[PDB]
């Protein structure tokens, strides 16, 4: 296994769009 | 008698039984509270005992930290965080140890965490628990038992204790939370646990959802969620996007048409109700939130200032949409009575109502072609939905514009309210019983 990293709420970056995803 | 014995027969169908075993434990925290604590927590903790015992040991735990009435829940957490420390340490031990080791799917051990976190976060005296739960969801090498069982148990604490007291600790719990949800998690028996208490966390996560790149990364967790053909989970994930669009409104407006409109939408129309009522409680909030909106636009006007927020007209834009949807569904009730009984149905009325009253214009033009279409119809559902329809839109629109369509309807309908079925009689009476009480 080399198993998913995660994701952490803290210390991020906050003439058409570039929206949204799924 | 060993413990597990006693604990065994508050299940028990022999009424003495019950008796018994209720009593010696009912004095037993009256008597021994901290050795009947710290035993109690072993039963809960060893995997070899009964799935029976296992939990009523666990209950034992959580009935003596905790109650409904707010007086003895204080009195309870008083009487706790009056224990011995070793004493509780070595029971808020084997509680925490307990997590991962459970074979039955409701954990026993969640509900004993969150009504011990209950009386000593709030006076620093178990500072370990929050980082250690964060740390089982977070460990890549924990099993998914573990995960479920942490994921409960901070959903609980999440539910059971004041938001301001987790808002320092938010990110942590954020994080734990929405590593549950990703779509890499393989078991949907812990997405759905980390949904469930993702709902509970939105009230101290305001600072995560104001910095657009977080945001951003919650409503895709959030959305790809709404997916997960474990329909438990689908109604979770609507959960959060329906509570989620009544405290950040302002923030939607990116999600809304990439996405939010095409799953609310067909959220309301999946044939299973538990789905469906989500959908509609999700635009029934936008409504109340445009307009409120509308109200405080209404008064920044007499300051001579534009207002502070600015609705977007989702509702009035979803309007060609949601209502042949709406009336549609007022044609799915329940015959044998669901009275009060909240079903899809009564839902998508409220809903009308609730558009009428926020379009009060716009909303009478989409509804009438269906009402005159079905008023004369066979079919006792689609003829009760018609008059159901009519009286829906009967507040908000100008008045001078609904009398004339009352006038010229009022023949038909009155007749309505003596028709063979039973259930347009019923509605065929409230309707009337508006158009009066409404304006006379």
Redesign the interface.
Known sequence: ?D??P?????XXXXXXXX???? | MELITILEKTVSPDRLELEAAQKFLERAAVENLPTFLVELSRVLANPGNSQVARVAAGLQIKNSLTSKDPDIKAQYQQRWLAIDANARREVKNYVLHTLGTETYRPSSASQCVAGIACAEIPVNQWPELIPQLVANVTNPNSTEHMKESTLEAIGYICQDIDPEQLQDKSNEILTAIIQGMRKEEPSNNVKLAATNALLNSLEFTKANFDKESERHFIMQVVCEATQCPDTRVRVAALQNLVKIMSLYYQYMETYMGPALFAITIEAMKSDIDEVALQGIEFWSNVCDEEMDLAIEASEAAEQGRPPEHTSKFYAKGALQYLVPILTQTLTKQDENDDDDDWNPCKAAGVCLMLLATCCEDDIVPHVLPFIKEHIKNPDWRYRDAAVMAFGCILEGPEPSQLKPLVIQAMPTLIELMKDPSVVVRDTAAWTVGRICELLP
């Open positions: 296994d198993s998913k995660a994701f952490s709420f803290g929206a949204f995803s799924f």
